[model samples]
Target: EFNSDLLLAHKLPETRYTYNERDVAIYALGIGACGQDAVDSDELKFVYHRNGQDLIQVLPTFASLFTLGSLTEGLDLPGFKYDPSLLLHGQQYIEIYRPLPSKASLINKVSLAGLQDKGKAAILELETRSYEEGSGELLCMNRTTVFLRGAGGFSNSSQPFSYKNYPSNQGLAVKIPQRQPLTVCEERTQPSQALLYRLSGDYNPLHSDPEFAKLAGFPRPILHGLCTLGFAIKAIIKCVCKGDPTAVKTISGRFLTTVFPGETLITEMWLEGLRVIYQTKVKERNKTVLAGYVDIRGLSS
Candidate 1:
């Protein structure tokens, strides 16, 4: 049973997160910035510095992971209960106010964005706003939507629970093309991809311990949804942005299925003005595992 009433009234405590240059570079590697070319002209700036360059360029997607702490550590939603096995990350949205710096402390404000009570399960949405610590400058915002299986039946049938606190602009509806995709790119994930991605601070054992995964109904350890996010974003970076990570203004994705390690991911994108509608599918299963779109501006050539 869930205390839905208490959860609706819960308030998140203010928290601060600090990251450094190494942290930024590592995140670049985690997301496949240089996976195309180790000395890639477009990616070198992300993880390396030259004789004259003073600071490295940061990726917009990197800002997306800053909210990890809010969702994992000290997550204090009152009266929320469920089996960790049934938890699923349904969607991710990131809106960057500015290019992130390589190193800085950030303050986060979290709030309940929305909630829906399905007959068989429930959906929870959370909004996180990140600001430069101390100075209080806004940096970015993240919206995380999660699906909770077996956590339904809390609401009375007379008044099924439903709520929406997000704005209209945050919708995930897609304008999928009737024509063939404009660009198609494929990349294979490493068997150790999950292991490497976890270094970026997403240390969920579901990606490491095999036994734990089986208990959760997976044949083997499964990749983190965010790890797949990195792979999908990489597709957009190289194919659409010409390898420019900063060119990304906003990115969103829906996790449709789980991806096994060491599998091939084929990302198909449709270029529509400034919006790049895309989907990532697993080659092995021929399943569309993720789908979303990215909006960009100012190609820094």
Candidate 2:
């Protein structure tokens, strides 16, 4: 088992990324929006605007831009090398202070929050905060927990760390009915999609290098777990929220299986009052991508 010190937390230089309509639309599509159909006029607002003057709002996943290259510095531990292949994303939590600006430069301050020894493996938590670059206004906070397989049982803490209560699964669950379906959109992932997405910030070779994949014990490179999650969010935002990110208050999910790039993901959602529970699956393989709850304020245009 590894100790807390194994994580190397540092405040790297902040990144300044400019967002435009194309970036917003591509990001939305990267997350699984504008599915199978020809891009319709309705979907264009999220991806394109003829005026070329309107700025689309930022998606919460934009925070990921600040998370690039965070893990390569090492988790601050000395001589605690473990197979990156055995790693799995355990959970992800993101909180938005206010709707992010559409075209603002931002700085992200990141660090290793803490670590836990779970006898058989260790769980590491990385926390990052994004704020407006010059104004320093807090925009969002993201917390990610990764399960380090076989990196546990170093004879350390027996219990996993606990945070606040998990989102409620209670209440009346609502299922979306397809009695009268409207339109279904689909998008295909490029084979090198993960490589490109990683370029946005995360540079873990595990997702790009085949040799690294072999070293990590996988047949090939796997997509970033969060990238898959981001795709699902994109689908929900486009379909249920009508391309409005503010309708989404919070989103959390569990990583059930690995999703290689170039697979088709079909996301379905069920609305229950202000809460929406959604799940994504690889249509080609019939495997669940991610499942979790999304809380919205209300359905409004």
What total of clashing residue pairs does each candidate reach?
A: 0, 15
- Model 2 stretches with alpha carbons more than 4 Å out: 1-26, 32-38, 77-86, 111-114, 154-187, 214-217, 299-301
For model 2, how does the per-residue alpha-carbon lDDT over 25-105 read when each residue is reduced to its tens digit?
A: 666555544444547544445555566625655677665555545554544454345556567778776767778665666
Most lDDT-accurate candidate: 1
The whole-model lDDT of each prediction reads: 0.81, 0.65
Put down candidate 1 lDDT per residue, 1-301, tens digits, no spaces: 5576677788877667888888888877776667767887877888888742337777777776777865544365665555555778899899878788888998888888888888788887888899998678888898888888887767788988888887857747696799999999898887888888789888888999999999878998988888788778777887888876777878898888899888989999998889999989999999999889888886545
Candidate RMSDs in Å, in order, are 2.5, 5.1
Return model 1's CA RMSD, one decimal. Answer: 2.5
Candidate 1, clashing residue pairs?
none
**Lowest summed lDDT over 10 consecutive residues: which window, candidate 2?**
163-172
